[PDB]
Amino acid sequence: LHKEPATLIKAIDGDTVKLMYKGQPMTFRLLLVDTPEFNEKYGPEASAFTKKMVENAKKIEVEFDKGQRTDKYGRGLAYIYADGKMVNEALVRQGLAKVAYVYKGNNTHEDLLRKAEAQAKKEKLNIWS
Template sequence: MKKRILTALLTGLLLLSGCSQPLAPPASNEKTAAAPQTEQTTSTKAAQSQSPNGKQASYPTDDLNLPRVPVELVKAVDGDTISVMFEGKKENVRMLLIDTPETSHPKLGVQPFGPEAKAFTKELVEQADKLELEFDIGPNRDKYSRLLAYVYVDGKMVQEALLEQGLARVAYIYPPNVRYVDKFNDLQRISREKALGIWSVENYAQEDGFHPEEQDRDAQSKSTAASGESPEPAETVASAAGSAKSGCSIKGNINSKGEKIYHTPESPYYERTKEEQWFCTEEEAVAAGFRAPRS
């Protein structure tokens, strides 16, 4: 009898022990396995949304897939101008929204970084298997009857490449031909921060064009700093130069586009402007064909 009771008790204990075991494997293994996948996905998204320099790499204009017109290259004219065969005729194409230093301007001659910009564009367009033009929604010709377009070599836009190398500035922003201006401004900002090309010389590339005299001034400043001499204050230089014409202080300057602009001492560009002509009054400057700088 005791044996039967003992056997029954043992059997009951074994049954209770079996019911207390988990019915499913621990969830911790599943979470551990999922963690690397989540981390990898986050990392991939970050890589897709940012460029190597940390800025946002995507723009609303990236996936437009707009039509492009295949053309045949005739030659590279300048950093921002090429000659092509378009609809059976030889046409000059001026690249939209950028400006590169001159190489053969009748008045300005060869400007710093002009030959580099031309050589860069020349190499791109001459080695391309496919050369294409993309037009914006506004006029596709300028006042000189040149075609206005975005130029592509094997799918890469030349304007972007020039801006990335610091060989062009963003310029001639005339709506509605401004499709890529936001992206161009970002590329220019990055090149400027890295002091590439035209941005390696302080104040050389300005809103009104290129100022070759700044290269000599920059070199002189660096030489003075290296020798340990104290540079002459800008106010003193301006004062001495201003006395060149009986104390007249208004500077007349002709920019890279051939525009005649005068700068009074209150102008933000006054100290940087190299005078080509002095005026005593603004009326005198206007009479000579000069205008005030645009704000």
């Protein structure tokens, strides 16, 4: 996999972000994670976490996996990096997302996110408390 440049247009929620990619606006949905909706418990916390992370970053990068790059809703499907730190991983580490939507061909970072989930779980962080 390879990292590609992109620019923040707007935070949306815990697992969706609007980005300028190859000069086109696109909604990106984070691979391999599920944050609660804004209206659910830890929803505002998940949204705030992602918001801070992408807004404070100097450099946003997009990394597609080996399978589909767009979902049935026309959302980009990617790992998103903020100053080299993967947003998908950070949410799971913090207990602000569950590992989820793991489909074959788009699962390069599965083991890495499952490690993070195991540590959030042992620490009973947020969703695991």
